[PDB]
Symmetry: D2
């Protein structure tokens, strides 16, 4: 085989044998297969079953031996540096997560420790991080619009925190690269968060300069909202629904009523119908109270970014008022309903409680779980495989809710978002 | 509107003597004002003025009614700020200062501006191409830029829209994937073109040369490779310049790659140019460039694989990596053309000429086409007595004429 | 009301509330007390009954609030910046050891050592070997001080880094000498690593010139940290604390599995320390035997030689670590047997129970001598150990008669030459 | 013959052939000899001795390389030129070349341009530069005192600007290396100014990190006093006396009355006599009106440094009040008598107006000249040849002044300062 050796890139710390011993290609540990599949997914921005990776503890730290790596990670026979660093980010995070399996508090403290360990939480930094959410499968006008928003974020020296993969997860950073270079903002941060079961489907771009691999969707979602100083939401499908519900259920909590921090739904003029309908689904379900937590801004990349930028002062002053950190919103209340890992199967979906009856937060947590199940069914290994052994996932409850959930899901199919 | 602008370690101190030259007093102030205005506009702004202030930490600039599009939520974009200081810097250097003299002036200007990096290895790619180009050409330029960025190559080009713009936008993306934080985007302009082709703020090294010929020389002395995209008379000028120079029998060993490249749609444009080039300069010319269509990677890869050759050849002439002293450029490439009806009419355009002399006159021919179109003084004189008229042997005149018509036909004008 | 807030610049990481509350700021809290004390000692480089320190979680990270810190930590009303950094290193290391009750015990210890050091940023993965460990007496005459200053200068001119204990005397001259040699050589990435431990840091506080302080949990963990980071070791004249160090490394380096470890050891001093090194060397060979001799040399009256031996070995240390597939910054392949790791708690049972007889592999006699000297130190300068002297009488040692003779002479020399 | 090549790092620009050819080894272009002497003095830090030394400037692929034919080897470390020495060699080249490519106003603008070209005037910088003056020839007690002052300067994050050479010219940078490292002040600045006719007698220490070659003693004096933020003066001989009279003569000008740069004479306890005597020289000659421009701090390194430090915000406020630069005191008034270069011979020395009856400032200007000639005849090439051709320089004037000057100069000899 072709052995490509990769030397340590952007500052990985030294590791002990103990830390790397579960990644040896042996028994399974199942840890090796998980480490392998993440690393292949990163080299990849049945197809590659003869790919392998070996971790070697050497004089300047770990060197990676790649056996039969994807040939498009290469530029003129070299591995793009961005992709190098990503391979080391995957090693760092699988390792930390592994030394730290040993409750709400546990989870939030874990999410903190992972992000601090990845260098994602910068001590003296002042608020400027915008989470951007949006669909992986979007047409050209939609894509160009996310590029322009990211350009307008760059011009204002804002940083981007986003998921990984194509579509809306990739437009903003490319726009930002140009907006940033116009402002000479060389300290830009492009954070892509992923988790092992979605990374193959939605692989990170090399332009991402801070890849962090969370252990599951729930913890990644927690990461996103604890770090966000502002959120921009583009049109998307089920995964983007999930995210919106996640944040609205949290922001409707009575204890979060003072959390400044804007949410801006934005998209180009053609996504007007998309937005009237999503906005209606929201207010037809969680209800009217929810409208106050986001705004809609169509056809104006600059107004989007400007709303993030102008909020940074309020965010910052709010964290001083709680005596909270800038980088991690510890005082945000996130109830266990939003943390509980959801494993989607026919029983767990069918056990979802979907009633207009409930307090809007608890209703939002259930729907979050609902959307997450549609995603898992669509893109994840185990989720797809349950939709093969048993056909589609089934859900029920309130007839009023089921009608509209159903409607939104059909719009997503109709609009090619699935 | 009144805004002040302070430098960010991008501006040396100046004495009162240097500055006094620049009070709203007048040759110098005017040129410095119009250069600075242009930079903020990347006619309609006659109330604009700028005041150079010497202050406790050096220069502050005070801006009277500066163009609103220079601003993002009411601050001036940092790159434009840097360009205002590059302008000051270069105006002062030049107007505070024999083929030999000219090249030594070009050197001094680039050195003074930081654009010649003593310890650096060759990776600067000169990029030439049209200012007015279609979506598909533009997109191609951006992909080439992306491919140059992925290979840690630096860009040096003119200013303004079109092909002067897309390659840096692409590189920003390719350099970022590559963590090439040290990238260099050199934009060379000159004061009577700057307003028409204003520097984008993404340019992080703007240099104002005295004139077109001095920019041309700057381009070719700093290039370690050249990539030429489809363009108009401006591009046709640059191409005649380099090939003119490259054909000099004492330049045979110079290994700078020259690549004409474009999208698949520009195949006919290119065949038309290869023709119109070997016809005028004769077949021996083709040995000095190549053509790569529909492949942004190959064009950036040829640049990349010649860097070790350029590096070795410079080491063989005990010559600098940053400045090609050893390249031989004859005085007919250097002489600053002020194109007018008279100078234009007067040009030796004759197949009868050995290529290099011919090149240099083509160079001037195309230069006055450009100046006839965009410069103030040109736009005045070709409106005061009509077409700058051209005279030479008639096979040339008609086939030089096809190409000029193609430019128009392709909206390159 | 003298109350001063200290900010970090960089190199304080964020902490969680869990982390900060585990400090237990209370009054009966032994941990906090140990934290308060290490932090007092850093500002002092009992008389300060009312010194207090508070750790605040703030928007930009940790800020510290000092109530009644000592006055000499101040230059015109401001705490010297090296000192401020010192306080955050203290907090970093107390907290990291506290969150780690994290194999085969020997492995747990070395991995703990590696963990503390790595967490402290003291193990730079990319760095080429250039770290020289310097050991030497805390109480030395000006001729010796001046000699260690001049070695430090020669180490600086050759762009080597220094790793050393904390406090006065030979723990201090070399860094001052290196500041000069490094400035001359434009080596701005110089590293002055000062290692200490809670129970000695008050007696031997860190000089603000140390740019990486690390607080290890005990004396044995620091000894290990020194030998695993060392690329080279220089040993100046010293007392029982320096003899401990010497016997520790020689014990280790005589192990056949360590035969190929190329880190040089140079005992060096001014011309007038010749009788000193005559007797030290004879004592090494008398106890550990003549095999000990191949592991060190002695360079008298020549600072440039001692540095040049360090400097010229660095490419050998380099080649050797790659031959062992080991790291540059941390020597995992070096073998250190448990008797060099096991923490010693000096009292009369423990001192009397030492095995000081000739009939044992020298590595093992080394290991026992290491604790003997350790006990002399503790009794001399540590709180708990100064009390056994107080409330019991002086430490009692027994063993092979010829060995006790030379060991008593050595200690009497130390006392005589005012090294203790 | 031993050839050593020198590579620059950064901190040397490219030069043209027009620029280099000026320094080819020629029969005797003064320019080669002077570049050569200057380069040889820098290698000698630490005369027909190195008659077979030569240096060749080469234009090479990364800029200039120097080829040393038979340098002094006595200061090499393990066969290599200490990096600070290599930088000095390129500082000499830079400065010989700049002056060789180049009326009160003209003199000042020249000083500015040489300093500007040398990197020695940093736009952004807040006032923090302390000129230290002091004897090249001093005992261990005095030397140790200068080092502790340098230490107390570094503790306060102040920079040092000084003459080159041994004694009080090196001690302070040595204390400052320790003080700065304690304070983590990595951006420290140690400016050593010098000029071609005295550089061999006072060679730059490699610890200097900004060597500047001024063209003559007067332009160095001007550079000193336009750059300074404060001035410390230690005991010294006729070169330190020259400096003291220079700055006093300047600071008594009516127009310089608001110029707030402090001047502090300081020394160890043993220099008390020296100072009583120096202070009465000053007051007997320039008058009581002189005492107001300095003070005297004996036996207290911290207090001298603290006076400089405490004065930085005052210097800052004054430059803004006079609308002047922070790095270069354009508004300070220096009369032509302080600028005009003085070539010491017997005529020019005899011509000195040392009359009792004269403006104090002008007396100080002629006393400045006087000591400059005493220095020139002790250490300068053309100065001694004048001594060799002719015997000692004869001065005359008001006889009371003459016995005092005579007393001070005899004291210098007595005290080992000549």
């Amino acid at each position: 085989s072709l052995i490509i050796q990769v030397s340590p890139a952007g500052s990985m710390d030294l590791l002990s044998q103990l830390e790397v011993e579960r990644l040896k290609k042996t028994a399974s540990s199942d840890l090796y297969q998980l480490y392998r599949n993440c690393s292949l997914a990163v080299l990849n921005s049945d197809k590659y079953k003869n790919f392998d990776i070996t971790v070697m503890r050497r004089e300047r730290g770990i060197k990676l031996e790649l056996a039969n790596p994807p040939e498009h990670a290469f530029v003129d026979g070299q591995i793009i540096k961005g992709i190098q660093e990503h391979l080391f980010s995957v090693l760092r995070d699988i390792v930390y997560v592994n030394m730290h399996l040993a409750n709400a508090t546990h989870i939030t403290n874990l999410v903190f420790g992972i992000l601090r360990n990845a260098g994602a939480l910068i001590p003296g930094a002042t608020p400027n991080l915008v989470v951007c959410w949006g669909g992986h499968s979007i047409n050209e006008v939609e894509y160009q619009y996310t590029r322009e928003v990211g350009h307008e974020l760059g011009l204002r020296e804002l940083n981007i925190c986003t998921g990984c993969g194509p579509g809306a997860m990739e437009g903003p950073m490319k726009g930002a690269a140009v907006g940033h270079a116009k402002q000479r903002y060389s300290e830009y941060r492009y954070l892509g968060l992923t988790e092992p079961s979605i990374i193959a489907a939605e692989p990170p771009n090399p332009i991402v300069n801070e890849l962090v691999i969370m252990p599951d969707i729930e913890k990644r979602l927690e990461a996103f909202v604890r770090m966000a100083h502002g959120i921009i939401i583009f049109p998307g499908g089920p995964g983007t629904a999930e995210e919106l519900l996640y944040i609205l259920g949290i922001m409707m909590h009575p204890e979060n009523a003072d959390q400044p921090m804007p949410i801006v739904l934005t998209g180009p003029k053609q996504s007007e119908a998309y937005f009237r309908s999503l906005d209606k689904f929201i207010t037809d379900t969680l209800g009217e109270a929810a409208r106050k937590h986001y705004s809609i801004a169509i056809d104006n990349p600059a107004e989007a970014a400007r709303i993030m930028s102008n909020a940074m002062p309020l965010v910052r002053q709010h964290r001083k008022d709680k005596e909270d950190a800038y980088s991690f919103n510890w005082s945000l209340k996130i109830e266990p309903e939003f943390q509980l890992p959801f494993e989607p199967n026919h029983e767990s979906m069918a056990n979802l409680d979907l009633h207009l009856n409930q307090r809007p937060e608890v209703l939002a947590a259930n729907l979050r779980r609902a959307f997450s199940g549609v995603v898992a069914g669509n893109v994840k290994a185990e989720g797809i495989r349950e939709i093969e052994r048993h056909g589609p996932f089934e859900m029920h409850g309130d007839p009023v809710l089921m009608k509209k959930m159903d409607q939104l899901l059909n719009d997503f199919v109709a609009q090619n978002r699935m």
